[PDB]
Amino acid sequence: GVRTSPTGEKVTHTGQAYDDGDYRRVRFSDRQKEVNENFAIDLIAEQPVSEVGSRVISCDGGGGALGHPRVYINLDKETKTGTCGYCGLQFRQPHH
Amino acid sequence: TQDTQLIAVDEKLDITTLTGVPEEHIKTRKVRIFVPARNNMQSGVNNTKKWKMEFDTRERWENPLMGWSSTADPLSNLVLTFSTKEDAVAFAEKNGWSFDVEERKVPKPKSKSYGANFSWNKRTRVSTK
Amino acid sequence: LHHALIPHGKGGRSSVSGIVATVFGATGFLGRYVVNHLGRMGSQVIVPYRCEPYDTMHLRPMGDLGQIIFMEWNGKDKDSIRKVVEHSNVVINLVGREWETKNFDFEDVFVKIPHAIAQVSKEAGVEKLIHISHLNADIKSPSRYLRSKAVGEKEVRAAFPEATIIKPSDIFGREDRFLNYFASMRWFGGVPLISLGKETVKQPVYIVDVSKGIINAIKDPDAKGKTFAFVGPNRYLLFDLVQYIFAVAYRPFLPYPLPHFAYRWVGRLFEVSPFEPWTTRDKVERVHMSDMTLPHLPGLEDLGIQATPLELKAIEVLRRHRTYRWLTSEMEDVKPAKTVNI
Amino acid sequence: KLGLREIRIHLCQRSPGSQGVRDFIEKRYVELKKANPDLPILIRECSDVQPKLWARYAFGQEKNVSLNNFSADQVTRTLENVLSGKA
Amino acid sequence: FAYDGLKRQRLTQPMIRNEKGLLTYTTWEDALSRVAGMLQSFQGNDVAAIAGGLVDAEALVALKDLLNRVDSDSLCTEEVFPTAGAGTDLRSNYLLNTTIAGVEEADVILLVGTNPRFEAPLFNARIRKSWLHNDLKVALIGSPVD
Amino acid sequence: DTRPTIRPRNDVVHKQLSAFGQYVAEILPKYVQQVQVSCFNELEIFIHPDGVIPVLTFLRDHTNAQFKSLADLTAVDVPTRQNRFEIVYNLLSLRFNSQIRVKTYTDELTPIESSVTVYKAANWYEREIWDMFGVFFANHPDLRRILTGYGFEGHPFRKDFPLSGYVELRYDDEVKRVVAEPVELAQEFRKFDLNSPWEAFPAYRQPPE
Amino acid sequence: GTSVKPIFSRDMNEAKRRVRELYRAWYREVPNTVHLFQLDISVKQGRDKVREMFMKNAHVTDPRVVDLLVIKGKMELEETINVWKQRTHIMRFFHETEAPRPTDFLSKFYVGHDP
Ligand SMILES: NC(=O)C1=CN([C@@H]2O[C@H](COP(=O)(O)OP(=O)(O)OC[C@H]3O[C@@H](n4cnc5c(N)ncnc54)[C@H](OP(=O)(O)O)[C@@H]3O)[C@@H](O)[C@H]2O)C=CC1
Ligand SMILES: [Zn+2]
Structure with a gap:
């Protein structure tokens, strides 16, 4: 979800938004900023949480060799769905 | 031992004029040495064995564009190497440069006794290995 | 200063000086040199261009990456100004046409647009403004060059309270159409000037002295409101220009004191060519008119910029006119013109 | 003001030249201080430095005298004359 | 864990009070002129100083010299140290004379009014x-802190 | 050498260069300081500065050495060593298909009489050394700045010379000519500290000096 | 170890000697290099440019180095005589584009953190 600034300046996922007083905004008129509308924060948020009944789940991320190293995910935290640092896919432990 | 019309040079060598560094960069440049302290997170020691020629850091203004650290200090990126401080100062004086000294960080004697870690009337007993 | 407007650097190409000098109409002479000076220590000089981008292409090399931001603009369009000076912390006016165009009445080039850019800049939120007037600016003078200059000079003065108005004398440079002009009577004819030159004393000034004046006026805070006049080091009676210029170029000296009556006819005939009015009726009495002393307003000399003599650098513009047999001749072979001055 | 404000000595712990002042501040130091519940003497003792004297008079008037190999009885003479003229 | 403090609330420009007494961004000339004007017509006790806690000795020398040339020799500090006696006189009165590297073999340490766990963590x-190791016996007077 | 990872060693010629190294050493012991060979069958005999003439004149003319193919005239700055500049020769024997290499030591000022006589190939190399490292050579026919820019300042491969340099260039309209301003980089060279603080090779380790 | 090999200057006088005709050639060199290279520089400020270059480095006393600038200055002259060097190279000594670096501590202070 891209957000706009008061001067109509759409913000990027990093949060950069040049204010009106910034002289560095003059390259922006007559032209445009390229904004990755697919904000990386919310195309992972809508992804569901898979249910695997094990204490440690591999996280290859699909594609076999095409993915991220198979860092093993610890699954015993009931209050925290264990997510992978590489791909961010949240993994869960069946509700006992 | 090298007798070919040798000149008895009694004055310290000053090759500063040949290298042709800018005049603002030979006087307004404090040049310092020390033997690097070991990176505390890394227990390895095979880096604190050499002296180096490093300089003073000038200003680093952010670029008007995307934001690279634009610098105008050519001498900043000049980390040299030196086996001993005597050779380090020899380079420093040979092209006479405003310099300071620093003493080699020398380890102390770690009196280690694994038998001490367990004791009867001594308090160095360790509760958990 | 603003969060990023704060200056930084050793005055290099990629050093931010914090001055955002949107110059108006920089595609010629003084515009070329000021941006060269503006871009030397690094500055976001937004140049609104109106001609073909090709003719503006040569302004690119004198700016760092993302510095010379050419912007489309039109004189009539009110919003055209407001977009190019919206974020510019300083505005340097340079608009004006020394010759005439049917669509651009001579009133406009010194009254309409100069007023049309001064009020928007003050409405935008700028700090400074520099509109370039003439050292001889005088409406009552028969010079439409002077007539339009003076009225526009006070309009921007009235519109902009901090309007640091500059009134340079007859500037000279590589493309000044003043030195290369005065070399051109040999090509055109027998030097049809008035009264053999013994009726007009002028004080030419080298452009870099002028351009260094504005940038020094930029850093000077007290320059606001004050109306500095940029004057050369020495004056020069008109005849001395003609013989000296014909000397530093090794041209056949053919002076002729053609009176003002017939010399006015050749002005319109030079405007007849519907591509460029080489010489105009305004330019007829423009050179006949002499330069007033104007001693009360401060000059560049007290501003830190000295004045370079004309005879110090002439062939730098005039070696092009020197023929092959004498292209190698410098100042020293040529006698200096009689310094009719203070 | 003609009066001295900070009378600064600079002596060494081991220097034989500093031995004279070392004897000075061993016996007559307390007498010098109790006579002056006011403007003090600044010792700032150091190592391997020739004994040295700075007189920080008022209104930026400073001057130095050397005391290398100078006995305790007459280093008091030396400070006496500089502090003699103070009013 | 103090580098982030460098970035928060950092003074960058000569900061002076406007006609409303509100601190505003001004060039160095105005700030220099403001201080210079009000120090020329003030001498002696009219000028003084309050030393902070994290200022190097180089500025300390400069501020001593600046005040003393005005004859403003009242170079005051923040941490109040009793002037009575030979406090400023003898260096021994304001030094860790035994040195941190020397406190190893001391049998008993009488800490006076201190909480070195937080007052000086390295100490x-x-x-x-x-x-x-050295069987040091510490003894603290005052609060029964940990 | 059943394992295919490491390269096999070759001992028959390995002993041959050492025998030839002693053979050269005995003939001219006035100038050979020390001679040695490495694992990769590369022998190096070390000469004194004023020895550029006869040692190469030896290898160029000897009936049993006849090393005539001049390979390269390199220099290696070592700031620690007093004679930091180390002029390195390299010769190839056509008949005996071997590569001799002689190197000397030289200060910034101390010259070397030009070895263009033994090998005129060195002449064109010799220009580069004074351009590239800056060591002047005595009685050289024409020892010129040939590879660096016109009117350059200093010697770029002295390890005290910045990688970026000292002067940058741009075309300036107000002079209509290229002006050499001092360098002002858009981005600073992000140096990388690439030195593992653990022992790399116990073999070549320097003992406590 | 004070006794070392000399290049050309066995003594100070020979170092003083070589500087002499080096200036003799270079003093005879300024008027024409301007003339051929079409430099817009009068002969006079060309001549004393060589002058203050000459004592911009005339302070060192070691005889081994002084003649090294002699040959360095010697061959900087050779490269100029035969139109190898161009307009930018001759002008390069005549520093133009950069503003004067600061003179008073006030000017050092106002520019930036640089000393
Ligand atoms: N000796 C002299 O010549 C002196 C001149 N002046 C004044 O200084 C000003 C600049 O001089 P100089 O740089 O030599 O002049 P040039 O003719 O070389 O350049 C004039 C500039 O004005 C711009 N301009 C003028 N009118 C318009 C318009 N209606 N719309 C858009 N752009 C316009 C031109 O843009 P474009 O090229 O696209 O048309 C061009 O960039 C002029 O007003 C001149 O009269 C002042 C004192 C002395
Ligand atoms: Zn994953």
Whole structure:
């Protein structure tokens, strides 16, 4: 979800938004900023949480060799769905 | 031992004029040495064995564009190497440069006794290995 | 200063000086040199261009990456100004046409647009403004060059309270159409000037002295409101220009004191060519008119910029006119013109 | 003001030249201080430095005298004359 | 864990009060002129100083020299140290004379009005190492802190 | 050498260069300081500065050495060593298909009489050394700045010379000519500290000096 | 170890000697290099440019180095005589584009953190 600034300046996922007083905004008129509308924060948020009944789940991320190293995910935290640092896919432990 | 019309040079060598560094960069440049302290997170020691020629850091203004650290200090990126401080100062004086000294960080004697870690009337007993 | 407007650097190409000098109409002479000076220590000089981008292409090399931001603009369009000076912390006016165009009445080039850019800049939120007037600016003078200059000079003065108005004398440079002009009577004819030159004393000034004046006026805070006049080091009676210029170029000296009556006819005939009015009726009495002393307003000399003599650098513009047999001749072979001055 | 404000000595712990002042501040130091519940003497003792004297008079008037190999009885003479003229 | 403090609330420009007494961004000339004007017509006790806690000795020398040339020799500090006696006189009165590297073999340490666990963490670390190895006996007067 | 990872060693010629190294050493012991060979069958005999003439004149003319193919005239700055500049020769024997290499030591000022006589190939190399490292050579026919820019300042491969340099260039309209301003980089060279603080090779380790 | 090999200057006088005709050639060199290279520089400020270059480095006393600038200055002259060097190279000594670096501590202070 891209957000706009008061001067109509759409913000990027990093949060950069040049204010009106910034002289560095003059390259922006007559032209445009390229904004990755697919904000990386919310195309992972809508992804569901898979249910695997094990204490440690591999996280290859699909594609076999095409993915991220198979860092093993610890699954015993009931209050925290264990997510992978590489791909961010949240993994869960069946509700006992 | 090298007798070919040798000149008895009694004055310290000053090759500063040949290298042709800018005049603002030979006087307004404090040049310092020390033997690097070991990176505390890394227990390895095979880096604190050499002296180096490093300089003073000038200003680093952010670029008007995307934001690279634009610098105008050519001498900043000049980390040299030196086996001993005597050779380090020899380079420093040979092209006479405003310099300071620093003493080699020398380890102390770690009196280690694994038998001490367990004791009867001594308090160095360790509760958990 | 603003969060990023704060200056930084050793005055290099990629050093931010914090001055955002949107110059108006920089595609010629003084515009070329000021941006060269503006871009030397690094500055976001937004140049609104109106001609073909090709003719503006040569302004690119004198700016760092993302510095010379050419912007489309039109004189009539009110919003055209407001977009190019919206974020510019300083505005340097340079608009004006020394010759005439049917669509651009001579009133406009010194009254309409100069007023049309001064009020928007003050409405935008700028700090400074520099509109370039003439050292001889005088409406009552028969010079439409002077007539339009003076009225526009006070309009921007009235519109902009901090309007640091500059009134340079007859500037000279590589493309000044003043030195290369005065070399051109040999090509055109027998030097049809008035009264053999013994009726007009002028004080030419080298452009870099002028351009260094504005940038020094930029850093000077007290320059606001004050109306500095940029004057050369020495004056020069008109005849001395003609013989000296014909000397530093090794041209056949053919002076002729053609009176003002017939010399006015050749002005319109030079405007007849519907591509460029080489010489105009305004330019007829423009050179006949002499330069007033104007001693009360401060000059560049007290501003830190000295004045370079004309005879110090002439062939730098005039070696092009020197023929092959004498292209190698410098100042020293040529006698200096009689310094009719203070 | 003609009066001295900070009378600064600079002596060494081991220097034989500093031995004279070392004897000075061993016996007559307390007498010098109790006579002056006011403007003090600044010792700032150091190592391997020739004994040295700075007189920080008022209104930026400073001057130095050397005391290398100078006995305790007459280093008091030396400070006496500089502090003699103070009013 | 103090680098982030460098970035928060950092003074960058000569900061002076406007006609409303509100601090505003001004060039160095105005700030220099403001201070210079009000120091020329003030001498002696009219000028003084309050030393902070994290200012190097180089500025300390400069501020001593600046005040003394005005004859404003009232170079005051923040941490009040009793002037009575030979406090400023003898260096011994305001020094850790035994040195942190020397406190190892001390049998008993009489800490006076101190909480070195937080007052000087490195000092407390050295006692603890000497406490564990050299059988150092510490003794603290005042609060029964940990 | 059943394992295919490491390269096999070759001992028959390995002993041959050492025998030839002693053979050269005995003939001219006035100038050979020390001679040695490495694992990769590369022998190096070390000469004194004023020895550029006869040692190469030896290898160029000897009936049993006849090393005539001049390979390269390199220099290696070592700031620690007093004679930091180390002029390195390299010769190839056509008949005996071997590569001799002689190197000397030289200060910034101390010259070397030009070895263009033994090998005129060195002449064109010799220009580069004074351009590239800056060591002047005595009685050289024409020892010129040939590879660096016109009117350059200093010697770029002295390890005290910045990688970026000292002067940058741009075309300036107000002079209509290229002006050499001092360098002002858009981005600073992000140096990388690439030195593992653990022992790399116990073999070549320097003992406590 | 004070006794070392000399290049050309066995003594100070020979170092003083070589500087002499080096200036003799270079003093005879300024008027024409301007003339051929079409430099807009009068002969006079060309001549004393060589002058203050000459004592911009005339302070060192070691005889081994002084003649090294002699040959360095010697061959900087050779490269100029035969139109190898161009307009930018001759002008390069005549520093133009950069503003004067600061003179008073006030000017050092106002520019930036640089000393
Ligand atoms: N000796 C002299 O010549 C002196 C001149 N002046 C004044 O200084 C000003 C600049 O001089 P100089 O740089 O030599 O002049 P040039 O003719 O070389 O350049 C004039 C500039 O004005 C711009 N301009 C003028 N009118 C318009 C318009 N209606 N719309 C858009 N752009 C316009 C031109 O843009 P474009 O090229 O696209 O048309 C061009 O960039 C002029 O007003 C001149 O009269 C002042 C004192 C002395
Ligand atoms: Zn994953």
